Amino acid sequence: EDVPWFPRKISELDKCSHRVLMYGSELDADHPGFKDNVYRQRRKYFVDVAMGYKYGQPIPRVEYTEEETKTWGVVFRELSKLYPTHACREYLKNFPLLTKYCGYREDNVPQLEDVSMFLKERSGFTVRPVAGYLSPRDFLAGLAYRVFHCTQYIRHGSDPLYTPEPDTCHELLGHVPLLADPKFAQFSQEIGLASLGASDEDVQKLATCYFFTIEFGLCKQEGQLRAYGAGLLSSIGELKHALSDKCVKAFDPKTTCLQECLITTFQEAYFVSESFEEAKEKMRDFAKSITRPFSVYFNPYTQSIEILKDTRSIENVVQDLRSDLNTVCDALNKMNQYLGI
Amino acid sequence: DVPWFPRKISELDKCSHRVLMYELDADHPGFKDNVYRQRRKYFVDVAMGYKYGQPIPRVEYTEEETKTWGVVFRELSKLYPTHACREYLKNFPLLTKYCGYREDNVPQLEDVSMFLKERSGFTVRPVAGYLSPRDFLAGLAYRVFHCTQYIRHGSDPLYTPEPDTCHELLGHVPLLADPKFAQFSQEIGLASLGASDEDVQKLATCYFFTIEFGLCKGQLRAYGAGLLSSIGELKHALSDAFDPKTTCLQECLITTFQFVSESFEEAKEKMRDFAKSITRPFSVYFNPYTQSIEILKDTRSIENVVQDLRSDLNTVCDALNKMNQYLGI
Amino acid sequence: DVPWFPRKISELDKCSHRVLMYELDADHPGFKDNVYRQRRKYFVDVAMGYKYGQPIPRVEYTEEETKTWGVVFRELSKLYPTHACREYLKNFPLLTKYCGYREDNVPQLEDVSMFLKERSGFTVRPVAGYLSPRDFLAGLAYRVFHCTQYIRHGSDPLYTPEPDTCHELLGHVPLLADPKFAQFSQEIGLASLGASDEDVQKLATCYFFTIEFGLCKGQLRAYGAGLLSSIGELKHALSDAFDPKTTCLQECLITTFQFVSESFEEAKEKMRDFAKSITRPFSVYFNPYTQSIEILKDTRSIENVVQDLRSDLNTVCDALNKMNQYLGI
Amino acid sequence: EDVPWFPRKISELDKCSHRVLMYGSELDADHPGFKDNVYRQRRKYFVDVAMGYKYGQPIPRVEYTEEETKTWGVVFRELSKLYPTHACREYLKNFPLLTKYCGYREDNVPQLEDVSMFLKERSGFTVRPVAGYLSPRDFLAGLAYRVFHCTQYIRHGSDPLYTPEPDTCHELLGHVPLLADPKFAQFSQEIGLASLGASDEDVQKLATCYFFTIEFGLCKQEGQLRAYGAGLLSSIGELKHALSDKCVKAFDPKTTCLQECLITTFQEAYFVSESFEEAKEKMRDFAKSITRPFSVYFNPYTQSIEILKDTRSIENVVQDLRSDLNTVCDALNKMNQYLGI
Ligand SMILES: CCn1c(=O)[nH]c(=O)c2c1nc(Cc1nc3ccccc3[nH]1)n2Cc1ccccc1
Ligand SMILES: CCn1c(=O)[nH]c(=O)c2c1nc(Cc1nc3ccccc3[nH]1)n2Cc1ccccc1
Ligand SMILES: CCn1c(=O)[nH]c(=O)c2c1nc(Cc1nc3ccccc3[nH]1)n2Cc1ccccc1
Ligand SMILES: CCn1c(=O)[nH]c(=O)c2c1nc(Cc1nc3ccccc3[nH]1)n2Cc1ccccc1
Ligand SMILES: [Fe+3]
Ligand SMILES: [Fe+3]
Ligand SMILES: [Fe+3]
Ligand SMILES: [Fe+3]
């Protein structure tokens, strides 16, 4: 096959995790911490911890500094005020659970290891510390395994409200709460699976889709508009605007991928899904249209990718689907058996 | 309302540690050899030590034990090409390649466990002692196999009084690597969850007659783990049908010598049918993502299963499109 | 490449008219009674006349024939509560209510046919004579049952030389009204399509042992159509297992007296399994909307089946939502 | 149940067919045939033929007059010119088949009985002559059984190009060709099934949806815009405009039902579906949202409606779905068996 390589077992994903195109140690010219050498040590320290991680090892716990904690607290405190009225219902349900089990409070910074075990029990997702920016191919590859790569560093203390870069605050307050949702999780994994062995152009179609959904997504819950995009949750200024008076469009994959992603500017438009079950099924049809010589089936038992290119593997799937339907019948039998319905 | 069973993988630790019997009778050679008894408590102590999320420990290489292991390893091998099912013979060379299965070495459960998880999703955990049939089968529901870390006494390699590492590694593990056998075992586990004790024993008899001692066939081969472990019975078994309702009834004989399965897909669906007859207020669906048990007692839980099955069918459609797309077929 | 079989309901007329035997032997009382022979050719002539899309004709009410019918109708009735499966007893009173099934009347196939189409989708068409097992089973694939319009001679009501209206109406029809029995019969039909002759006969033996003469059971009852027709054998049958592969082998005895089916859902899936063993280059899917046969030999045809099955599952989901919505369950 | 009555067997549909709210005999004040008493006899004649039809009878053949035939010919001739370039691909494939089997030519007018047997073999649909306008409830009820009610009369000969009323030309050239499509057929039946036992407001939501899809629908085939709506096919003036320079919107049920249907005026907007399989699945999700105490399953064997309100009927469906999946496996087995794939 002439197709692009993609990890076919969970252990192979480490290759993706470590292909860092730009390390966190590398600060851009206009960055606030660019002349702060105390800050740089921390960035280098976090990069090193991430580089040391390999599959099968517990996610390392790190002790945050006091100013970092205050920085986290400031972000945590300000965003909390806007969540009751700007966050989606899925976000609201999960967030208190995080306070109880992951130490999600103003004076404490959660550990990825805590969050990972929390996520694995509730939605099957896990987190990995990432040393820096990855190729969209390698990043989305992680999603196929329900693995989210997280930055472990804190934004510069100079201005807590603003960040030009993803940080642990963005990871913890923006992404994690909604990753816990089983339906949101399936939706995320669909984007990942779609990328596997796809062309670069298709990958970046998916990357754009991810950007306007996971990063900046709005969903209508109970007849009202709420935000579920992680970027929106992290940014107070943008979050206000997203749900404010004045441009929203329905989430359609084919239409959405065309748009351009802006880092500095408030986004041109914000897309909407009635539900994550809708987004997952609008993704799984889009995934069919993606060009590749095979389809992919995810085996959660062996944590590997099955390639569906012959009738043998396909029937095997169908046979499985038959047995599972038999279990559905059992449940319906028992339900009639015990409730007379 | 119903007998408690673990609903998360982490809750399974409760099952592993409920050991009815840890303790050797007069017949066993253990009291006779004081040195042997000292080691056994250590292996028992380690099993008690084990907690979920902890890598399986690696034992000290003792050549006397290691020498004993070698005898069993070599002797059983001559028999396998002649008496074992293809699935065994597929997996055994791989065990030699990756889990350091060799005559002079004893495999460490951590190696074996990581091997199984990649191939069929099974993992093994060391068990302190004999478990209730309820708790043992509960592990199977999670594709967790409990193993005995300790090795039999050196006095007689051929004869074994109780299950040992040689039995678990040479009898069970090669078959636990087969995805369909794995699905078959889990069905027995799942069926037991929240069942009446008697239903559980019925299942234990089924398990005994298939997983521990069992045959499949256009030739006849042995797939029973106890058969793989025992040289004499294995010959007898091939020397001069599987229906669960009928099979559960027959008695289990510990010392005296005592079914045919076409394939494991058969044994998995003739098991899943048996599950319906089992008395409980719910059906069970296993969630491999969260490694937990879903209880199907309402329409809400049932629908999400069905919806999931819908999506999986769309993937089947995608595969068929692409197949036509590239081969015109 | 494979033996031709009708792929549309309209093509089935070719099958109906391929009559090997229309013609009475010396043993039959027909030559002896010249009057009886005159009527029979007329019924044979009408069957030949029948074309698809034409309402079944209604015969002249002849009291001699009608009187003969009455004897069979009343005599068999005493036996049925004692010897017939519940499905028969469900349908028979309805036949009395809607198809003018009474002691003094002979039902007209058009009435019977319209009754069956509402309840199980089956229809009946008059057949001129004995058909090839291939063509007869082809009708079953379309849920079309071929019937003999003519009635047995008045000399002896109890004894029947060849199938007649009494046999078709009192033996077959009450069971053709049951949706699951209907699905079961169609499976036999579908399996035969494009099969080798020998596979076809194997199926004919299966059909003979189930549809014509067959029993189901926590009590034992007769569901065979020939059994319902014959007073003596019916008693014998209940007096002092169904596996298709095993069952096809046993010989069919015309004069001498010669399986148990739990339910028809069983007999339908133990039939559909037998279909896989049958040798052909395709599988068959029946399209009830266009009343035609789909041939599954490519991914295109297979996918559309799967997609359809996806939509049907969404309906299942809708039902479950509403069920929770209204009952909180 | 307090729910509105709907036919539960195919024979019960006759009640729906004969509830005519306005007969064809009744001509409106501005109608072109309003003072033509030769025309009125024909309208009354067609109404009478329709009233005489009952289930199980062959659809009566009628002999058309010469001026009617010329009128049909004129419509047939002019519309043929715009089909190669305005019609959808599904329309184009079917139309020649109609010429060969249903006598679809300029000098002949097709008989409903011919068309019905044609449709029944290819997509399971049948036609019924209808005496006049039906309630949207009763009309859609027919679709649930894949039965389309057709007018059998010809528009006034005064002006063949224009008609304020549905006529046999509209039925034959607008509706029938696309009804033959198996996928379009399933789509139509979904609208029908959805209406069964629904509220009046829901019914007219569906009626609006039907209007903007079946009557005035545009579909994108092979990257180009084509018309599949029956109204568009019948009307040359509108058909030109529908695909012309200048307003099109994507077909969404929830959005579409809100719009108003105009008889005289060119429609405000025209909706689009990528395919009929898309429209069917966008309908079947909309059908879930429709309020009723049950779901409906269509039994094509007995031509009746199953009510799914308990676990017994639902399992029975699931069991059926299991067996059909077994057949899928057989096909895949045989395919590997014979082709090694
Ligand atoms: C699909 C796009 N995309 C990609 O192609 N590759 C990524 O590595 C990536 C990513 N997206 C995010 C996470 C992320 N969150 C954001 C919030 C606001 C703006 C950009 C963001 N990127 N990452 C992780 C990341 C990003 C920058 C620095 C460290 C880690
Ligand atoms: C279903 C019966 N059954 C049970 O109810 N509970 C168990 O704990 C169990 C078991 N079966 C086996 C393992 C096993 N392998 C055997 C081989 C031959 C004979 C008996 C065997 N039991 N075990 C594990 C075990 C058994 C004895 C001592 C330590 C561990
Ligand atoms: C599968 C065997 N088989 C076949 O191969 N071809 C048939 O045409 C056929 C048939 N079986 C039956 C009907 C039938 N009912 C019976 C009852 C008792 C004994 C034999 C019977 N055949 N028929 C119909 C028939 C039989 C004889 C005279 C006229 C019509
Ligand atoms: C769902 C709307 N709708 C309804 O509620 N009831 C209907 O009876 C109906 C209908 N729609 C059509 C058929 C039809 N084709 C049209 C083309 C252009 C304008 C109106 C049209 N109605 N009919 C059939 C009909 C319409 C008018 C006169 C005779 C027969
Ligand atoms: Fe992000
Ligand atoms: Fe064992
Ligand atoms: Fe018969
Ligand atoms: Fe119309």
CATH no. of D10-309 = 1.10.800.10
Cα–Cα distance for residue pair B297/C314, rounded to 1 Å: 20
Longest dimension (CA), chain D: 73
- Quote the Cα angle for D83-D86-D90, to 5°: 70
The 10 Å Cβ neighbour count of residue B215 is 20
Contact, A239 vs A232, CB < 8 A? yes
Q: What is the DSSP string of A187-219?
A: HHHHHHHHHTT--HHHHHHHHHHHIIIIISEEE
Contact, D266 vs D272, CB < 8 A? no
Cα–Cα distance for residue pair C47/C126, rounded to 1 Å: 5
| Helices within chain C (DSSP H only) | 12-16, 34-49, 63-83, 86-98, 109-119, 133-141, 165-166, 173-176, 179-192, 197-207, 225-229, 231-238, 244-249, 264-277, 299-327
Residue boundaries of the structural domains of chain D: 10-309, 311-341
- Chain C residues with CB under 8 Å of A339 CB are 329
Chains touching chain B, criterion 3+ CB pairs below 8 Å: A, C, D
Q: Is residue B171 lining ligand 2, measured as CB closer than 6 Å?
A: no
Cα–Cα distance for residue pair C223/D252, rounded to 1 Å: 53
Nearest CA in chain C to D11: C118
The C-alpha of B290 sits at a distance from chain A's nearest C-alpha, in angstroms, of: 5
- Chain B residues with CB under 8 Å of A333 CB are 276
Q: Which residue has the tokens 């500094």?
A: A65
- Quote the Cα angle for A34-A40-A45, to 5°: 155
Give me the residues paired with residue D20 across strands: D134
Interface residue of A301, A308, A329 to substitute, partner B, most B CBs within 10 Å: A301
The C-alpha of B3 sits at a distance from chain C's nearest C-alpha, in angstroms, of: 23
Which are the residues after which chain C is interrupted (C to N > 2.5 Å)?
22, 217, 240, 258
How many angstroms is it from B148 CA to the middle of ligand 6?
9
A332 with D319: Cβ contact below 8 A = no
Residue nearest to atom 27 of ligand 1 (CA): A133
Cα–Cα distance for residue pair D10/C79, rounded to 1 Å: 37
Which residues line ion ligand 5, judged by CB < 5 Å? A 230
What phi and psi values does residue C283 have, to the nearest 5 degrees?
-110, 160
- Chain C residues with CB under 8 Å of D328 CB are 296, 302, 305-306, 309
The number of the ligand nearest the C-alpha atom of C19 reads 3
The number of the ligand nearest the C-alpha atom of B140 reads 2
CA-A130 nearest atom, ligand 1 = 30
- Chain C residues with CB under 8 Å of B303 CB are 317, 320-321
Residue nearest to atom 13 of ligand 3 (CA): C163
Cα–Cα distance for residue pair A268/D40, rounded to 1 Å: 61
How many angstroms is it from C213 CA to the middle of ligand 7?
8
Cα–Cα distance for residue pair C117/C121, rounded to 1 Å: 4
How many angstroms is it from A111 CA to the middle of ligand 1?
20
Cα–Cα distance for residue pair C258/C214, rounded to 1 Å: 11
Q: Containing H/E element for C144?
A: strand C144-147
| Helices within chain B (DSSP H only) | 12-16, 34-49, 63-83, 86-98, 109-119, 133-141, 165-166, 173-176, 179-192, 197-207, 225-229, 231-238, 244-249, 264-277, 299-327
Closest partner residue to D328 (CB to CB) among A250, A318, A328 is: A318
The DSSP call for residue C26 is: T
Q: CA B109: distance to chain centroid?
A: 14
Residue B259, CA atoms < 13 Å, CB-side half-sphere: 24
Closest partner residue to C281 (CB to CB) among D121, D185, D334 is: D334
CA-A21 nearest atom, ligand 1 = 8
Give me the residues paired with residue B216 across strands: B221, B261
A331 with B143: Cβ contact below 8 A = no
Is D86 one of the annotated binding-site residues? no
Which residues line ion ligand 7, judged by CB < 5 Å? C 212, 225
Residue nearest to atom 26 of ligand 3 (CA): C130
Contact, B153 vs B33, CB < 8 A? yes
Q: What is the DSSP string of A241-271?
A: HHTS---EEE--HHHHTTSPP-SSSPPS-EE
Nearest CA in chain D to A322: D322
Distances from the Cα of A226 to the Cαs of A208, A238, A340, C187, in angstroms? 21, 13, 41, 53
C167 catalytically annotated? yes
Q: Is residue C148 lining ligand 3, measured as CB closer than 6 Å?
A: yes
CA-C133 nearest atom, ligand 3 = 5
Q: Which residue has the tokens 């007769």?
A: C222
C172 catalytically annotated? yes
Closest partner residue to B118 (CB to CB) among A9, A317, A331 is: A9
CATH no. of A10-296 = 1.10.800.10
**Mutual angle of helices A112-122 and A89-101, in 10-degree steps:** 130
Point out the catalytic residue in the list C83, C168, C212, C230.
C212
Point out the catalytic residue in the list A86, A215, A238, A273.
A215
The C-alpha of B329 sits at a distance from chain C's nearest C-alpha, in angstroms, of: 6
Q: What is the DSSP string of B273-312?
A: HHHHHS--S-EEEEETTTTEEEEE-SHHHHHHHHHHHHHH
CB burial of residue A323 (10 Å; 0-12, 13-18, 19+): middle
- Chain A residues with CB under 8 Å of D319 CB are 329
Contact, D120 vs C290, CB < 8 A? yes
Closest partner residue to B310 (CB to CB) among C302, C313, C320 is: C313
Give me the count of residues in chain A: 341
CB burial of residue B255 (10 Å; 0-12, 13-18, 19+): exposed
Phi/psi class of residue D146: alpha, beta or left (left: φ > 0; alpha: ψ in -120 to 50)? left
Query: Ligand 1 — pocket residues by CB below 6 A?
Result: A 130, 132-134, 136, 139, 149, 151, 165-166, 170, 207, 210, 215, 231
CA-B225 nearest atom, ligand 2 = 17
> Residues of A comprising the binding site for Fe cation?
170, 175, 215
Q: Is residue B131 lining ligand 2, measured as CB closer than 6 Å?
A: yes
Q: Which tokens belong to A168?
A: 């642990």
How many angstroms is it from C129 CA to the middle of ligand 3?
9
CA-B135 nearest atom, ligand 2 = 6
Distances from the Cα of B1 to the Cαs of B196, B203, B281, D254, in angstroms? 11, 21, 10, 45
Contact, B8 vs A121, CB < 8 A? yes
Q: What is the DSSP string of B15-67?
A: HHT-EEE----TTSTTTT-HHHHHHHHHHHHHHHH--TTSPPP-----HHHHH
Q: C116, C105, C5: which is closest to C56 by C-alpha?
A: C116
Q: What is the DSSP string of D3-64?
A: SPP--SBGGGHHHHHH-EEEETT---TT-TTTT-HHHHHHHHHHHHHHHH--TTSPPPP-PP
How many angstroms is it from D139 CA to the middle of ligand 4?
8
The C-alpha of D341 sits at a distance from chain A's nearest C-alpha, in angstroms, of: 6
Contact, B286 vs A302, CB < 8 A? no
Q: Is residue C126 lining ligand 3, measured as CB closer than 6 Å?
A: no
Q: C-side interface with A, Cβ within 8 Å?
A: 323, 327, 329
Cα–Cα distance for residue pair C313/C318, rounded to 1 Å: 9
The C-alpha of C240 sits at a distance from chain B's nearest C-alpha, in angstroms, of: 25
The 10 Å Cβ neighbour count of residue B184 is 25
The 10 Å Cβ neighbour count of residue A246 is 5
Contact, A170 vs A234, CB < 8 A? yes
What phi and psi values does residue D157 have, to the nearest 5 degrees?
-70, -15
Distances from the Cα of B267 to the Cαs of B176, B181, B280, C177, in angstroms? 15, 9, 22, 36
The 10 Å Cβ neighbour count of residue B72 is 22
Contact, A59 vs A129, CB < 8 A? yes
Closest partner residue to D315 (CB to CB) among A310, A318, A329 is: A329
Give me the residues paired with residue A28 across strands: none
Contact, D136 vs D192, CB < 8 A? no
Q: Containing H/E element for D330?
A: helix D311-339
Q: D178, D184, D191: which is closest to D136 by C-alpha?
A: D191
Point out the catalytic residue in the list C65, C153, C172, C185.
C172
The C-alpha of C325 sits at a distance from chain D's nearest C-alpha, in angstroms, of: 8
Is C212 one of the annotated binding-site residues? yes
Closest partner residue to C324 (CB to CB) among B299, B306, B313 is: B299
The DSSP call for residue C210 is: I
Give the technique used to solve this structure.
X-ray
How many angstroms is it from C171 CA to the middle of ligand 4?
49
CATH, domain C9-297, list 3.10.180.10, 1.10.800.10, 3.40.50.720, 3.40.50.150: 1.10.800.10
